[model samples]
Target: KPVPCGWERVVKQRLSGKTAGKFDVYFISPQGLKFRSKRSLANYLLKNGETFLKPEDFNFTVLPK
Candidate 1:
């Protein structure tokens, strides 16, 4: 089967310098717009007319550094 539309390749952007934290999640679109939160990302995709079968349809994967 083919990958569905609006599938996100989420990544974590680690804050550097004096404001470092665990990390904030983000996903970049083909248009190069970056979303910094799950809700905002989901909202943008949904607003752009994407489909989701569940209330929370997005998945995030984080690997060790």
Candidate 2:
């Protein structure tokens, strides 16, 4: 798996909204903090001490909705 450690990736579908039928990519940290983008995820992980997460560790692929 590209995503290792305690990090979790979630790709959810928007059922009803202006962005309906679209998919949203979210990354959850080990502390249960939700990150909306890979950039933000990197910021937290990189800032934390002794963390080694990278941009490639996250998969931003949008699956078929």
Candidate 3:
């Protein structure tokens, strides 16, 4: 499974630092909106007119490969 059509998923590792060994997931909307968290993404979907699109469609809960 993958992100919604026209959407892009980006997972980048936090190289080296105090917060190393972690990953950051970004969801790019079809219109170029960048979201960094599931909560924020859900907020946008709820506010915007994206009726048919739900937060679950993006699959943020299933992190990692």
Candidate 4:
């Protein structure tokens, strides 16, 4: 499946940043975005009962160096 309609470009642009570099990212309902990094994808995880399903099923993958 593709990244959410209005989110692909946004995610790609952010993922292109030198800091995050190549990391996978995805959108999990409620129109929110999630991403993985050596840093912390969990931090973006929406609490307040928003289910993430799984972190591996990301819509965008960044090839971090």
Query: How would you order the candidates by TM-score, starting with the best?
Result: 3, 2, 1, 4
lDDT of each residue in 1-65, candidate 1, tens digit only: 13234445654655787756765556666567777777887788676745438746756667789
Residue 10 in candidate 3, Cα distance off native in Å: 0.2
lDDT of 4 at 31: 55
lDDT of 4: 0.47
lDDT tens readout by residue for model 3, 15-57: 8989998999999988899999999998888878364857768
Candidate 3 displacement at residue 40 in angstroms: 0.7
Off by over 4 Å in 3: 49-65
User: For model 1, which pairs clash?
Assistant: none
Clashing pairs in 2: none
- All models, RMSD in angstroms: 13.8, 14.0, 13.0, 15.9
Q: Is candidate 2 or candidate 4 better by TM-score?
A: 2
Q: After superposition, how far is residue 41 of candidate 2 from its true place, in Å?
A: 1.3
The residue pairs in collision within model 3 are none
Q: What is the TM-score of each candidate against the true structure?
A: 0.42, 0.61, 0.69, 0.20
Kindly provide the TM-score of model 3 when superposed on the true structure, using C-alpha atoms.
Answer: 0.69
- Which residue pairs come into collision in candidate 4? 22-62, 22-63, 22-64, 23-62
Regions of candidate 1 where Cα sits further than 4 Å from its true position: 1-21, 49-65
